[PDB]
Amino acid sequence: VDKRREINNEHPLLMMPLYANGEEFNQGKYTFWGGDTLTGKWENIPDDLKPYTVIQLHPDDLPKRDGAARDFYEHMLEEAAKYVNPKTGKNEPIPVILTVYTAGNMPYYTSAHWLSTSWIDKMYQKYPNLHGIFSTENYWIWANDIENKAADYLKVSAKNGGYFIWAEQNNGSAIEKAFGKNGKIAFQKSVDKYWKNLIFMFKNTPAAEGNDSTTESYMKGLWLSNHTYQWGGLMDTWKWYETGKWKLFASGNIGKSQGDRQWLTEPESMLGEEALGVYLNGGVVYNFEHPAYTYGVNNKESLLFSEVIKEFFRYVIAHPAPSKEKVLEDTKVFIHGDYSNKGNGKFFVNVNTDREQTPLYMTGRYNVIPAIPGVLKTDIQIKEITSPEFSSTQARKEYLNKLYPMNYEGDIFAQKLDNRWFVYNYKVNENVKQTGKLKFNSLEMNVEFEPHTYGIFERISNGLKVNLNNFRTNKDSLWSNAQDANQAKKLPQLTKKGAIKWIEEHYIKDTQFGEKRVTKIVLRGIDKLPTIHSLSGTNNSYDQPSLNFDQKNHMVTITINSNGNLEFELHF
Numbered sequence: 001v002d003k004r005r006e007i008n009n010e011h012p013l014l015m016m017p018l019y020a021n022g023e024e025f026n027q028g029k030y031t032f033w034g035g036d037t038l039t040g041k042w043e044n045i046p047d048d049l050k051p052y053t054v055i056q057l058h059p060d061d062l063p064k065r066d067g068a069a070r071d072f073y074e075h076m077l078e079e080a081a082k083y084v085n086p087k088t089g090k091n092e093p094i095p096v097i098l099t100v101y102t103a104g105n106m107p108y109y110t111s112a113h114w115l116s117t118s119w120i121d122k123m124y125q126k127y128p129n130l131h132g133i134f135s136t137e138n139y140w141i142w143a144n145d146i147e148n149k150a151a152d153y154l155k156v157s158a159k160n161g162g163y164f165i166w167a168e169q170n171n172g173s174a175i176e177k178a179f180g181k182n183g184k185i186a187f188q189k190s191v192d193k194y195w196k197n198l199i200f201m202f203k204n205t206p207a208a209e210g211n212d213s214t215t216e217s218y219m220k221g222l223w224l225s226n227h228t229y230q231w232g233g234l235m236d237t238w239k240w241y242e243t244g245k246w247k248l249f250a251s252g253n254i255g256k257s258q259g260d261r262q263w264l265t266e267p268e269s270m271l272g273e274e275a276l277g278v279y280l281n282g283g284v285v286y287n288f289e290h291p292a293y294t295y296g297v298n299n300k301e302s303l304l305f306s307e308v309i310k311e312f313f314r315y316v317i318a319h320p321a322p323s324k325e326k327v328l329e330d331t332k333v334f335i336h337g338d339y340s341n342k343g344n345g346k347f348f349v350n351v352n353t354d355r356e357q358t359p360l361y362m363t364g365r366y367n368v369i370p371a372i373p374g375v376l377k378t379d380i381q382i383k384e385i386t387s388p389e390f391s392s393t394q395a396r397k398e399y400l401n402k403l404y405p406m407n408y409e410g411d412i413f414a415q416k417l418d419n420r421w422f423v424y425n426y427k428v429n430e431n432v433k434q435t436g437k438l439k440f441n442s443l444e445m446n447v448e449f450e451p452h453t454y455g456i457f458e459r460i461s462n463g464l465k466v467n468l469n470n471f472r473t474n475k476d477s478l479w480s481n482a483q484d485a486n487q488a489k490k491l492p493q494l495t496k497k498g499a500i501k502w503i504e505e506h507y508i509k510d511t512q513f514g515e516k517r518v519t520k521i522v523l524r525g526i527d528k529l530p531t532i533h534s535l536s537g538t539n540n541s542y543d544q545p546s547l548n549f550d551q552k553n554h555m556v557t558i559t560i561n562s563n564g565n566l567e568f569e570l571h572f
């Protein structure tokens with residue numbers, strides 16, 4: 001059946017979440033938390049991005065009873081279906097994805113429980129603008145018939161030419177079980193027929209359990225082995241709450257005690273560092289939480305959205321991610337087996353991650369090593385997870401080091417694609433500068449990055465194109481009146497409503513921008529003083545870069561002082 005949309009490297013997808021306000025629904029009003037509206041939100045999306053963005057409805061705290069989610073969803077599907085573009089005056093139905101399964105669809109957790117497969121089929125038939133359905137976050141409540149239900153969602157989507165999109169994390173072997181590890185094989189068999197209509201994403205919310213790397217490995221491997229059409233990630237600023245962090249760089253752990261302050265605190269640019277792990281490995285679907293901080297409120301873009309996500313998403317449209325063909329050519333090792341039997345996220349710590357609790361990598365040398373669970377058949381060295389090479393940290397590196405050569409110097413994350421070096425500082429909550437030395441041919445480039453900074457350096461015919469992002473606003477005001485972790489833990493709760501109000505009042509406006517901070521780029525093998533061209537970036541966020549040319553040493557030091565996004569070319 002003809003696909004309702006394309007999702008691939010040239011046609012990536014940004015999911016745009018809208019969360020139902022259940023309190024207001026009880027009063028007969030149809031509204032979203034944060035005050036976005038379906039029509040206003042769509043209208044605000046830049047026209048260039050509209051072909052690649054889909055509205056994702058989520059039932060959030062709708063009443064947990066029959067009829068509530070169906071009622072709210074039908075209301076919104078009608079709004080989407082009859083939208084009129086005014087400019088054009090033409091009816092242009094808004095593309096929609098419905099959230100249909102979450103928290104195991106337990107009747108004590110979600111109104112989505114009372115959305116039948118029969119109702120889903122009827123919606124797809126009624127609304128050509130319904131492009132897919134979404135299951136999200138079930139690892140902690142792995143319902144008895146989850147795999148059976150997932151098979152039904154995939155089939156009903158394939159029947160109608162829509163996509164079934166599942167965002168899940170390998171906590172408690174979730175991804176392995178989905179494909180039949182524990183004998184529940186309905187979904188495995190569904191995928192054998194309908195993988196062209198499946199999108200599989202990570203969901204990095206449960207940061208305390210450290211399953212980021214293994215989940216992403218699986219996502220990439222399932223894609224490479226034709227067990228999902230495309231893959232991606234849902235990146236979640238609640239990870240800061242899950243790991244008990246508070247004020248940026250501060251000592252002490254406050255555990256899960258200040259939720260609504262905590263999901264605001266993750267550095268804006270760190271979401272781009274996370275998203276790079278998707279792009280660089282051929283993933284093409286992106287989604288974020290908490291929506292109020294990552295997207296915005298009241299139909300306006302937050303600064304995280306405008307300065308990081310929108311720029312990054314424009315980048316992956318203009319430079320499509322590597323194709324399956326290409327990723328597959330580049331893969332030297334493919335793992336077959338269950339990470340859950342080999343320490344789960346611990347498998348990669350001190351291989352390509354610096355700690356158990358991180359969504360980042362410490363080296364791009366192996367990029368992301370792809371895997372599929374042991375229940376799947378295979379169907380490049382394909383290596384069983386139980387083989388001697390994987391028995392320990394050192395063994396893993398020895399084996400991988402023969403097949404993936406060292407291709408840069410320095411304690412920093414860097415990965416190369418064609419003429420481009422992608423670089424970031426991998427520290428999460430420690431204020432440590434990092435440095436690296438990268439080579440194009442010939443041209444040798446050193447960089448020094450503070451934490452929460454990524455750059456893309458592209459060798460061009462007359463020099464170097466640079467895109468830099470270190471956007472990080474000051475969140476200290478949220479942690480005012482707390483001199484240590486003990487005092488922070490006891491602050492009055494910000495609350496969900498208070499945090500939305502803080503965003504309106506102190507983020508969307510009256511922003512406490514962060515201090516400008518220094519990045520250095522050193523070019524070696526240089527004949528003359530390079531010149532800077534096409535300089536642009538976040539408004540009022542950067543000084544004019546400074547150059548220092550040592551003619552005898554064929555080298556130039558470029559000093560940038562900034563806090564935001566930035567782009568320019570050097571000609572030489």
Ligand SMILES: CC(=O)N[C@H]1[C@@H](O[C@H]2[C@@H](O)[C@@H](CO)O[C@@H](O)[C@@H]2O[C@@H]2O[C@@H](C)[C@@H](O)[C@@H](O)[C@@H]2O)O[C@H](CO)[C@H](O)[C@@H]1O
Nearest residue numbers: 019058060061102103136137205238241242289290291496
């Ligand atoms: C109780 C609450 O504050 N709920 C809002 C909050 O929900 C997320 C957090 O509570 C997070 C803590 O790490 O746990 C996540 O489970 C939860 O996500 C929401 O619930 C799960 C089961 C899934 O359905 C998710 O899609 C959903 O977001 O933050 C979200 C927005 O990030 C909402 O405001 C919740 O109402």
